[PDB]
Point group: D3
Chain length 304, copies 6
Amino acid sequence: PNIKIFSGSSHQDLSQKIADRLGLELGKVVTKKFSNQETCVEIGESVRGEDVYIVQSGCGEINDNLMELLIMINACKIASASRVTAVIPCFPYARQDKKDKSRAPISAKLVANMLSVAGADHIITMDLHASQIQGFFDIPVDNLYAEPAVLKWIRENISEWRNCTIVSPDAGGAKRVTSIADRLNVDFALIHKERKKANEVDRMVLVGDVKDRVAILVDDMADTCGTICHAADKLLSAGATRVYAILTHGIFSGPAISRINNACFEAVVVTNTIPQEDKMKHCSKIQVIDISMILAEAIRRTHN
Amino acid sequence: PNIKIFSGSSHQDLSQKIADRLGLELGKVVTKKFSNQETCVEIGESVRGEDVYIVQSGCGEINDNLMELLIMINACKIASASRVTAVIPCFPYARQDKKDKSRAPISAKLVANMLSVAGADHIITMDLHASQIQGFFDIPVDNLYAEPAVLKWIRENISEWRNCTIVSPDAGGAKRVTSIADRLNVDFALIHKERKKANEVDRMVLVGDVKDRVAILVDDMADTCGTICHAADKLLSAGATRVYAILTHGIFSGPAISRINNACFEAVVVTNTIPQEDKMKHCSKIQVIDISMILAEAIRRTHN
Amino acid sequence: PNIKIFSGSSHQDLSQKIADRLGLELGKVVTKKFSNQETCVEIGESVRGEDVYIVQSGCGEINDNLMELLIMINACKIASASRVTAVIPCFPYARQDKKDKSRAPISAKLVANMLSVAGADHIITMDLHASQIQGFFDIPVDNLYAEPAVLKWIRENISEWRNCTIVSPDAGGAKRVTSIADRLNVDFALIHKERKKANEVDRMVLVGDVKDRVAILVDDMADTCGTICHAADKLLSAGATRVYAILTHGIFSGPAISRINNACFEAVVVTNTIPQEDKMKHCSKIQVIDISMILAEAIRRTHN
Amino acid sequence: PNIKIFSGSSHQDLSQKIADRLGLELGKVVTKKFSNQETCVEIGESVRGEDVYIVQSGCGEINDNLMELLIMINACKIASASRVTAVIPCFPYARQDKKDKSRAPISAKLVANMLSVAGADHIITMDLHASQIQGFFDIPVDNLYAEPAVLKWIRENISEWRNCTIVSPDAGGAKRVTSIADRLNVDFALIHKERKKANEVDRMVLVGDVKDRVAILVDDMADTCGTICHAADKLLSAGATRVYAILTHGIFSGPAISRINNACFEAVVVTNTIPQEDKMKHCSKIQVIDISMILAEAIRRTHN
Amino acid sequence: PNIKIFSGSSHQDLSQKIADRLGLELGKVVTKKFSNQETCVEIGESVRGEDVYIVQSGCGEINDNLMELLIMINACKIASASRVTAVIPCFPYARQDKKDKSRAPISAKLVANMLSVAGADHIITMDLHASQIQGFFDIPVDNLYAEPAVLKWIRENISEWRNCTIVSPDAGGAKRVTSIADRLNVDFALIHKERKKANEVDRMVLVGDVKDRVAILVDDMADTCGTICHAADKLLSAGATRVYAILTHGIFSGPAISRINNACFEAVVVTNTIPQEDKMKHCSKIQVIDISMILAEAIRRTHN
Amino acid sequence: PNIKIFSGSSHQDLSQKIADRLGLELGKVVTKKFSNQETCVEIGESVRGEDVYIVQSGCGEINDNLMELLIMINACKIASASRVTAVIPCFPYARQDKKDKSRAPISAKLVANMLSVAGADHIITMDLHASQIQGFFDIPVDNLYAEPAVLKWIRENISEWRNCTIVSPDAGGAKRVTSIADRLNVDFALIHKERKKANEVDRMVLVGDVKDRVAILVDDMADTCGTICHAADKLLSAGATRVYAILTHGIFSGPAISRINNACFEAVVVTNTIPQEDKMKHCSKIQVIDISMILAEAIRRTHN
Ligand SMILES: Nc1ncnc2c1ncn2[C@@H]1O[C@H](COP(=O)(O)OP(=O)(O)OP(=O)(O)O)[C@@H](O)[C@H]1O
Ligand SMILES: Nc1ncnc2c1ncn2[C@@H]1O[C@H](COP(=O)(O)OP(=O)(O)OP(=O)(O)O)[C@@H](O)[C@H]1O
Ligand SMILES: Nc1ncnc2c1ncn2[C@@H]1O[C@H](COP(=O)(O)OP(=O)(O)OP(=O)(O)O)[C@@H](O)[C@H]1O
Ligand SMILES: Nc1ncnc2c1ncn2[C@@H]1O[C@H](COP(=O)(O)OP(=O)(O)OP(=O)(O)O)[C@@H](O)[C@H]1O
Ligand SMILES: Nc1ncnc2c1ncn2[C@@H]1O[C@H](COP(=O)(O)OP(=O)(O)OP(=O)(O)O)[C@@H](O)[C@H]1O
Ligand SMILES: Nc1ncnc2c1ncn2[C@@H]1O[C@H](COP(=O)(O)OP(=O)(O)OP(=O)(O)O)[C@@H](O)[C@H]1O
Ligand SMILES: O=P(O)(O)OC[C@H]1O[C@H](O)[C@H](O)[C@@H]1O
Ligand SMILES: O=P(O)(O)OC[C@H]1O[C@H](O)[C@H](O)[C@@H]1O
Ligand SMILES: [Mg+2]
Ligand SMILES: [Mg+2]
Ligand SMILES: [Mg+2]
Ligand SMILES: [Mg+2]
Ligand SMILES: [Mg+2]
Ligand SMILES: [Mg+2]
Ligand SMILES: [Mg+2]
Ligand SMILES: [Mg+2]
Ligand SMILES: [Mg+2]
Ligand SMILES: [Mg+2]
């Protein structure tokens, strides 16, 4: 079997980078929409007995892209592919990973079941919102981490990183922040927005010392940037000299770009698990880390 | 168990009509989008041990609506509903019901598998593009027909229906047209667009006599209305006095409205398996048949 | 893995032809009946890690043959075959492909499920009665077409084929007839037997012109030959000079042979998806098209 | 839910007896053959939300009957039956319960899988050839025993039963014979036909004393009656006064009737798990035990 | 259906309390070991059509108890129980919820799959180590919380609770501690043991102010009590006046009792999700919160 | 793919012997217990695309070992092993192979389902208590026999084996004893312990002649040795000169060692499907047959 790399419509630049790093051309696929907005998938070459990798991030038109991915997986399976791997750099519906409300769906589990029934044999993803999503499948799931790239960026771009403090923007990010602070041998702090019991002002509590130090906000994602922006205001109010934000998934939906442009961030650093070209054109603060080498190595090791 | 009727975002007017005919209020559901365009489903009441019917047509934002339906089905199943029935008046991806091309997906089968893995126990649908889609599930699938309503409309709205000829716009509609012509005891004709071997003019062959008679075009759906419009031009060129078009699914995507407005149709008749309010505002020729009684009776009989 | 071709009891001559075209000997199998008429299957060689193809048509003792096929598939799977492919030239129960009656089984779906649970990984078949039967499986299903062989026979055996008209014996055959007429660039006609509302005479309506032309009846199968015989009487009554019947599946059950012998057919042409040796001995009008090359190529391409 | 009893073509007299003992009429089913010998099943009434019991023994046209049963189960499941129970008095392919030969199928497991995929929720059977066949399903399997009826017959029909010896015709029947001898507080003996190493005379070894005593041969089934006839010759040669044979499944295939008529049996006693009307007309030695009360009680207790 | 409560060998006192609160007697079960240490389960009453709840905590002989639970679930399913619910107050293998090491099993997912294949229809558990374990099943999973009982204990047993600080013993407990601190409107602190890069002294970093205040350590479990004991030493070294430890799962395996007896805890508070009778006899500091009302209410609401 | 042999904690000496006979080193695995007695499995090498064989007998800590085996199978499957084979020399729970009691579990079927859901693709076992356990899986199951080794031992260690009688200790062993007696061309006898109707003395009935001959007791297993010890007393009381006991599975649980030491056995012969080192130290009568060559050949042939 040979590696066949197919791109969905979501992140074709990343698919191209992966294919170039693998020394391959992207597989011939036409991924369009029928007139009635149904997903049209036209695989343009044989995948018989091939090791098929389909790259599709959960971003942009989320349901469009997920349906595209499922249809492409099923087409490859029925086309007698030896193995079909879904390379999903940002797993869609990953934040819906539990039922902590009445009648709430576990949408991540539903997405996993849909991928399984489409015929996926392997999942490669980066920085799952919850690592337990690996357990939502009965197939191997590669949960790659961008933390080494994030440490590289910190050591190369922040001069006073040895005296910095890594800040969690919420309680759920504590493990990630403590891991990064341990690897950098630096202090850490945590910021918590307390629960909205009524309609008073949202107030943020900070535990840890950030006074007269560079604060690096590290989180798994920035969707609306409310978390990181509120944390940044709190950090400046607490005496931080400079504030950085490093995420692995830059979703930047809704008011995020205006929020960041009006915030105090020295830089907002994200990986390219989600396309950032449009976001960078409206926010100069955004910088991107390439994770295509991580995904390419994951695909190569999965194949080998 | 009690009937619980939940509406997706696709066709809420039809859901309301079904609920009124059942003497029920629609179940409390919030069906919105998160900021990153992920489907958000918030069932607002208990469905424990209930007989849940979710109404969601394959129309509008097709993948959005299908994901909404799957998430709602899964939420109801995990919320311990006694039975979850997907009422899908127009089955999405129904035209992708076979693999007659290399690497082509059977998207209808994938949709059926996704509905099954979401936890649907029963499917109620109207006029499947292929009745064999019933066999794509391992659960009961109700394939309701709007043909009786179509005969009622013909007998009540076309004065010379006893001398009319029912015309198939393509070869695949022959069974439907012959059935309708048998029930009306009228002649039938078939129109075929021959295969596009090169880039010459599309030419249509008509078998049957339509000269100086009213021609009724009957088909399962009109997506772009290319089929019915070309058939209408052929029928007028063949000497038909008046031309009607009766469909059960009025998709009317793309250039369909302009095509119909510039066509010679006496009336374009569709059911309300797909919302038609917007279409009727731009095309006076469109008239709608209510099939809410058929769906309500199907739901009631399924429950009983 | 190596190709292993095993024959059931149904069509062993076709299995032999396939094996010869593949340059192989048929695998050693004893397919008999126990005294109590239970199917006895004794595979006489190892199939460990082999690519096993089991040839069994749905014909003759239908349930006997299908049980034989299922038992052989399961034996090969438990015997650790690398892949088991069911080569079913005529798919049994294919006409029971939908539920259009109360309490009606979808027997084709049941047969597909039985083949899947027996352990089939691949299905190779010719001219499924409904192509959607491909969607009854979750494994790849090859639906081969004998249409090219049927065009070859027409061009080589009917002198006036360029002025002929291809006739559908019922409404359901319209797509097949239109495709053949397009490929031959000839006229087509359709014959419909209207529905039996009471016990009066069956009457047939013909749409299209067949007067003073050779009429070629093309259908997917001739079971009792009532359809083709009634169509032939109608065609002669309509002024056809000569009438041919071309089928891909010659079932010829019940009164078919006497019907054909008393009909006006110039020739009844079938493929050898079903054994025809016995039928040809009692009906000189029957001629056979060899499709063993199509099946052999399908098996070879599936393996490769 | 209400009890619905449906009969296959195999044993309709037993189905009638069960229905009468349950105070019910048999459900309306037409179980015939299409012209091409495909099984035709036409359930003539609603089974929606019903507790459906389908009675079909593995006997007569074995594959015909099993396909009939599977099609009826699937039709009932798709017809939204609350529960479908297969009442199979004699389980087909039960003797193919293991793989003790190269490439041998486990046909009993295949039959169990086919019943499961057809949609059976419950199996009721009598005296499985191997009780471990219960483990071939993931659904409850009732393995009823006719041993109490066999003890009743012995105590009522054999005057010297207290001095009799119960004889196993082979090594595999030892448990059944020891159980019966324990319940009767009588001696037991075992007869073994040693393995056929070459083409010499089959010789039988008897362990136990049967001299000048009535010998009762007890086995689970008599297919060709070679086992019981050879055992009877051995028992007479060993000095048994009278020889009885009691089976639960009287298959009596092939030469069994001539073998019994030429044997020395005082009586051959079988249950009516298989129809015996034809067998009794040609062999006066055959007597039948009614087990319809056992099956009716099993169905009633399953329902309750 | 009626509630049937069955106890495994793990926590029979809790099962008795649940049954008393439900006004029921425990179902008759003999749960012993065969001589070869295989689990022997003897359900002593009918569960046909019953709503069966099996109470078995993951504690004591973990694999013994889990096998007992699986065997009891399967026995109830094969005994035709209407519904089988596994009441597992402490989910076994819950800490093995992800693959963050090469070749590491996801044992929680394996346990979920084993429970599913045993036939469990519903899981009721308290304070899953990871809430995403709910997504390891395709059945409803009730993840009950003992947090309200923990707040009740704090408000009733700690006089200065309004000036206390709730302390996380590790980074992973941050969400639980922040939730509790929000509900009590008190400060929170976090303690992190930094990663063991080499064999030097384990050192703990504290973020937050605990000086001259009562510190309440809140965590999901205390297995060896290394986490809480090290956190307690750090808290006293940081100037905490008194230190409490509140857990929901008191495992207290290995050296935990000696560790607590030599620690500075004012009280170690656990729920009775695990039996604590033996632990309390050797450690006076341990106090227990009854959660039997939570489990009983969960069972009652699941049934209703 | 390469053979990877992994040992569980149950029988590591047998795993070592198998690996040496295969010319391999055992795969690196740490199989220990966490503090709370949960099974800890740490596979120390890659198994990607490997043919993994896990050796784990059902013996010792039965549930501990079975959980170890399941966790190792699942870890290998998630670690992308090409194929995972469970080499289970003594199948656990094999005696719970049917439901002959109310509410009784079929624990063998549950174990098979657990192995299947853990991801086993192949089972290799020796002398299943019931061969129908092969049918409890849908994967190939190798049921190897130690009978040839048992015949070798008899012919090499019993001087008067040609005049011996092979004795079944119960009715269920009759087939095994008759097979062995046929292969040795010797007489056979059967011993039955009649059913315990009340609390009187257990009495044993012997059928067959053992007077003044060597008696060889052959059974599938000796758990408590009650069966073989009672049979030995009966055989001596019946005039047997010497009594041997040959088993394939020496469980020797509970009072078995004291029973054998106080019995009259010339030798108790078992295979090493279960470790016997401890048993031989307390009972000089026990001798062991090596079956490692049988298991090694089975693994090699499965791989090839
Ligand atoms: N795309 C989305 N955008 C915004 N909110 C979402 C989205 N998907 C799910 N949610 C909602 O967000 C919430 C999950 O929030 P979040 O992941 O920040 O915290 P958590 O899971 O409660 O705790 P933590 O991650 O700190 O352990 C849920 O209520 C979920 O329904
Ligand atoms: N939403 C869609 N809009 C347009 N074309 C579609 C859509 N979905 C599928 N198709 C394509 O349309 C074709 C199916 O066309 P159609 O159903 O008219 O004819 P058919 O299935 O070949 O024959 P017939 O229905 O006459 O038996 C396929 O090539 C399929 O990929
Ligand atoms: N072997 C068989 N012989 C005869 N009739 C059969 C057989 N199997 C199924 N049938 C019945 O024949 C009918 C199917 O007929 P047929 O395939 O000619 O038409 P259709 O499916 O209604 O329409 P069309 O094929 O024209 O789209 C069903 O009522 C089915 O039960
Ligand atoms: N319907 C049948 N008629 C005759 N033989 C059959 C039938 N079905 C299976 N067999 C064969 O009969 C054999 C099974 O024989 P039988 O059940 O008498 O003995 P066994 O299973 O080896 O041992 P025992 O039942 O004494 O424990 C197998 O070789 C099987 O293939
Ligand atoms: N019963 C057990 N006892 C001890 N350690 C266990 C047990 N089960 C699993 N482990 C191991 O403990 C580790 C999990 O530790 P823990 O749950 O404290 O932290 P985490 O999952 O890495 O992060 P966190 O819970 O803070 O988000 C894994 O290495 C796992 O293999
Ligand atoms: N590990 C075990 N130790 C002891 N008894 C067990 C064990 N596992 C199951 N049993 C019980 O032993 C009985 C099975 O006994 P046994 O296998 O000797 O006879 P059988 O299956 O009734 O008949 P036979 O094997 O002679 O055909 C059942 O009641 C079963 O529950
Ligand atoms: O609130 P947003 O900034 O839109 O979302 C980003 C954060 O919110 C969620 O907890 C994520 O895990 C991130 O920590
Ligand atoms: O009616 P018969 O000639 O027996 O059967 C042959 C035809 O009937 C069915 O529609 C088939 O598809 C063929 O078109
Ligand atoms: Mg979250
Ligand atoms: Mg967060
Ligand atoms: Mg179509
Ligand atoms: Mg059409
Ligand atoms: Mg037809
Ligand atoms: Mg047998
Ligand atoms: Mg026998
Ligand atoms: Mg923790
Ligand atoms: Mg047994
Ligand atoms: Mg025994």
